[PDB]
Amino acid sequence: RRYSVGYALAPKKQASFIQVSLVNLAKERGIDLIKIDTDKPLIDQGPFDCVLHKMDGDDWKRQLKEYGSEFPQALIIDSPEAIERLHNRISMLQAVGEVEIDCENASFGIPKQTVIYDAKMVSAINLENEGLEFPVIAKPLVADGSAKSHKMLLVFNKDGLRKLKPPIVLQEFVNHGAVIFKVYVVGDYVKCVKRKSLPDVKERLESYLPFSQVSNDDKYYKLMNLENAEYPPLSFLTNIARGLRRVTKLHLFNFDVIRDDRVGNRYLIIDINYFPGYAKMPNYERVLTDFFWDVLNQNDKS
Ligand SMILES: Nc1ncnc2c1ncn2[C@@H]1O[C@H](COP(=O)(O)OP(=O)(O)O)[C@@H](O)[C@H]1O
Ligand SMILES: [Mg+2]
Ligand SMILES: [Mg+2]
Ligand SMILES: [Mg+2]
C-alpha cells in the first residue's frame, strides 16, 4: 500500500488532468500523485514508483534516462521513444501494420500516403504511379501540437498542388460519411465517441480547401446529426485498441477511425495521439485511479 506517482505535465494539462476529485480519489486508493518540479533535476526528487509525463524536448529525455538508470524499477508512463513515434505522421501510423487480431468481419489499415519534403518535390509529384488519386489531403509532417501542425489542405486537382506547404504527408481523402470515431485508451479500458468530420467529395468552385480545427452563424445551415452513422463493431474497436496498446507500448492514447464507405467493412486509422484530454470522459477519476493501481501493482509484483 501507498504508491507514489510523480507527474510532469504542462500547466494547461495539469489544470485539466489533475483535478481535486482525481487527487482525492487516488489518495484513498493509496496512490499519491506528486508534482514534479521540472526546473530541478528529476533524479533529485522523489524517488517515485511511477513517473507520468507529457513534456517536450531532449533535456527532459536526458533526465528520464538519468532517472531510470538510478531507479530501474520505477515505471515510466510512457517511454519517450514510444511517445516520439507519434511526432512524425509517417511513423505515427506504422504501428497499425503490426496489429494482428482475428477479425475477418472487417478489415483495417491506414490510407494511402506519400511524403513531399520540399518545393522541388511538389514539382515532381505524380499521384498516379503512387496509386493516389485526387481528393488528397496534405498534413504537416511534424505533429508537435502547434497550431501549424493542424493546418491542413484539401487538394482537388492538379492546381492546388501549388498551395502545398511542405514538409507534408500527402494522403488519399477517404469518403467516410462525415464522422470520425475517436477511440480513447487507458491500458485495457476502451471508450469511443463520434465527432464531426469532413463531408464526402461527391465525384466545385475551388481547386483546394484549407481547414483546421477552428474550422459564422447568419449563414444558413442545418447541423447534420451523427445518430444514424453506425459504430464500428465493439469487439473490433477494443481488439484493435488493445493490439495498438501492445504495439505502440503506450498506456494512454486515443486514435481516430474512419470507415471507408467505398468498401463496406474497411476501417482506417488516421491519427494516434499520446495522452489526450481525459477530464470529461465519464468516470475518468475512477478509470485513471484503477489504471495506476493496476500498472503499479503489476510492476510492483515484478
Ligand atoms: N485520409 C483522410 N480522409 C478523409 N478525411 C481525413 C483524412 N485524414 C484526416 N481527415 C480529416 O481531417 C481531420 C484531421 O486529421 P487528423 O489526421 O486527425 O489531424 P489532427 O492530428 O490535426 O487531429 C480529421 O478529423 C478528419 O476529419
Ligand atoms: Mg517548477
Ligand atoms: Mg485527429
Ligand atoms: Mg493528431
Residue numbers in the entry: 8 to 210, 215 to 226, 234 to 320
What is the paper's account of this structure, in its own sentences?
The synthesis of inositol pyrophosphates is mediated in plants by two classes of ATP-grasp fold kinase: PPIP5 kinases, known as VIH, and members of the inositol tris/tetrakisphosphate kinase (ITPK) family, specifically ITPK1/2. A molecular explanation of the contribution of ITPK1/2 to inositol pyrophosphate synthesis and turnover in plants is incomplete: the absence of nucleotide in published crystal structures limits the explanation of phosphotransfer reactions, and little is known of the affinity of potential substrates and competitors for ITPK1. Herein, we describe a complex of ADP and StITPK1 at 2.26 Å resolution and use a simple fluorescence polarization approach to compare the affinity of binding of diverse inositol phosphates, inositol pyrophosphates, and analogues. By simple HPLC, we reveal the novel catalytic capability of ITPK1 for different inositol pyrophosphates and show Ins(3,4,5,6)P4 to be a potent inhibitor of the inositol pyrophosphate-synthesizing activity of ITPK1.
Refined against all data to 2.26 Å resolution, the final structural model had an R-factor of 19.0% (Rfree 24.1%). Relative to AtITPK4, ITPK1 possesses a “tether” insertion following the central subdomain, while AtITPK4 possesses a “tab” in the N-terminal subdomain. The tether comprises a polypeptide connection between the C-terminal β-strand of the central domain and a helix of the C-terminal domain running under the protein. This polypeptide lies across the top of the active site cavity, linking the two domains. In all the ITPK1s of known molecular structure where this polypeptide is resolved, it provides residues that contribute to the ATP cofactor/substrate binding pocket. Consistent with the absence of the resolved nucleotide, this region is disordered in the crystal structure of ZmITPK1,38 but in StITPK1, it is stabilized in most parts by adventitious interactions with a neighboring copy of the molecule in the crystal lattice. As for other ITPK1 enzymes, the active site of StITPK1 is narrow, unlike the more open active site in AtITPK4, and features a highly positively charged active site. However, due to the lack of bound nucleotide in the crystal structure of ZmITPK1, the central domain is displaced relative to that seen in the potato enzyme structure and InsP6 binds in such a way that in-line phosphoryl transfer from the γ-phosphate of ATP is implausible. On the other hand, in the pose of InsP6 predicted for StITPK1, InsP6 binds with its “receiving” 5-phosphate in the F-specificity subsite, contrasting with the “receiving” 1-hydroxyl of Ins(3,4,5,6)P4 which occupies subsite A. Again, polar contacts to the ligand are made by Q224 of the tether region; thus, the bound nucleotide may stabilize the central subdomain and a portion of the tether, enabling recognition of InsP6 and catalysis.
